């Protein structure tokens with residue numbers, strides 16, 4: 032499926048977190064490290080969104096609305112995929128892998144354990160890189176914003192990406208004719224973790 036190939040080649044290069052080595056470890060350092068990593072990931076996510084077919088043909092407002100509603104889900108799906116080959120550890124970056132102790136010290140134990148629940152499920156499903164890049168595009172298109180202008184166009188985008196997933200799964204996993212549906216059913220947990228994380232992100236006043 033062409034869309035998948037396209038998403039695969041438009042996939043952004045790895046970003047380093049570069050935690051400040053002179054700063055003592057604390058919950059503030061973790062939050063600062065993560066706060067700066069996401070900022071840079073966000074800039075790249077925008078450049079990546081423009082590669083999704085049909086996306087840059089939406090109005091500017093509609094483009095913002097989607098990103099503004101899906102940014103956290105996308106950042107979270109990334110750390111999750113980077114962590115599939117690990118155990119009880121989240122790889123925010125190659126130079127910033129958080130274990131349970133660091134999560135506790137960061138006051139993110141509950142949140143990270145929820146991100147680990149997502150990872151646990153995808154490991155079980157043997158989530159391929161192709162499904163990762165597509166699910167990420169879908170999460171953006173299906174972000175459920177309230178301020179979309181052209182609802183038809185956004186639903187259109189949703190459909191072309193959904194079709195790519197369905198098509199990919201139809202040819203790569205003939206052994207499971209319901210894989211695509213299983214993949215779509217992992218989205219609720221993603222939405223759930225994302226909204227809870229966004230909540231925390233505001234309680235902390237990050238901005």
Ligand SMILES: CC/C(=C(\c1ccc(O)cc1)c1ccc(OCCN(C)C)cc1)c1ccccc1
Nearest residue numbers: 065066068069070106107110228231232237238
């Ligand atoms: C779960 C870690 C995280 C962020 C994160 C998620 C995925 C990823 O790849 C990198 C970081 C996080 C932290 C800050 C943030 O704000 C950006 C806006 N400001 C900093 C300009 C977004 C996500 C976070 C979110 C809310 C509170 C505390 C931590």
